Amino acid sequence: GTEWEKVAQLCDFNPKSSKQCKDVSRLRSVLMSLKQTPLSR
Amino acid sequence: DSLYKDAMQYASESKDTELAEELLQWFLQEEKRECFGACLFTCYDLLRPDVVLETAWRHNIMDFAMPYFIQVM
Amino acid sequence: DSLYKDAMQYASESKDTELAEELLQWFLQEEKRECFGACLFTCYDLLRPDVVLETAWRHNIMDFAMPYFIQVM
């Protein structure tokens, strides 16, 4: 479980990344990051 | 030196192809698969999942990388 | 009391969303995976397989549920 915490601490795809271009693939990546966020234990 | 998720940012902002794939392959030749999913999610708009999943699972060490394919689906 | 595949019928005939997902999550919080595929097949018209795969594989259980994804394919 610590590996997911390390991945989050290294490359947390926070919604603050919306400053970039509003690409649909980037929106899908943000949604996937928001769905994976509850996995942090 | 920038192996701790910093050159990945440059590769993502480069907006070019056939650049992040080399870093992905380097993350598989050496045991660095822990950041493979992060590199996939950062360069989501610049990669091809059909070959990414194959290279990540069959061609090299059995990495899962499942959330990437889930978001692709 | 109606845990023997009866509330699943109510959730299916309800034709509403965000209802069968709660039953799926309850089937994973407690060890009741014997009816997970049945609940998936009964309420197929109300579920999203993309998040179902994640919830069933990575979230709190190492379940396969392959025939459901075969029907999705």
| C64 part of contact set with chain B, CB < 8 Å | no
Tokens 């799926």 correspond to C24
Q: What chain C residue is nearest to B71 in terms of C-alpha separation?
A: C50
Give C10→chain B minimum CA distance, Å: 29
How far is residue C23 from each of residues A40, C49, C66, measured CA to CA in Å?
23, 15, 19
Resolution (angstroms) stands at 6.3
E-assigned strand segments in C1-73:
none
Radius of gyration of chain B from its Cα atoms, rounded to whole angstroms: 11
Which DSSP string corresponds to chain A?
-HHHHHHHHHH---GGGGGS---HHHHHHHHHHHHHGGG--
Residues contacting B8, CB < 8 A, separation 6+: A11, B20, B23, B35, B38, B39, B42, B43
Distance, CA of A32 to CA of A28 (rounded, Å): 6
Spacing of C-alpha C53 from chain mean position: 10
Q: What share of chain B is helix, strand, coil (3-state, %, to 5)?
A: 65, 0, 35
Find out whether B34 and B7 touch, Cβ atoms under 8 Å.
no
Residues in chain A: 41
Task: Give the residue among B8, B63, B4 at the shortest CA–CA distance from B31.
Answer: B63
Distance, CA of A7 to CA of B33 (rounded, Å): 11
Residues contacting B17, CB < 8 A, separation 6+: B46
Residues contacting C34, CB < 8 A, separation 6+: none
Distance, CA of A28 to CA of B3 (rounded, Å): 25
* Helices of type H across B1-73: 7-13, 20-29, 36-42, 49-57, 66-72
How far is residue B8 from each of residues A31, B30, B35, C6, C51, measured CA to CA in Å?
20, 16, 10, 51, 27
Give A14→chain C minimum CA distance, Å: 20
Angle at A38 between CA A14 and CA C57, to 5 degrees: 120
Ramachandran angles phi, psi of B49, nearest 5°: -65, -30
Question: What end-to-end distance do the CA atoms of chain C give, in Å?
Answer: 35
How far is residue A5 from each of residues A14, B58, B66, B70, C11, measured CA to CA in Å?
14, 26, 17, 20, 36
| A39 part of contact set with chain C, CB < 8 Å | yes
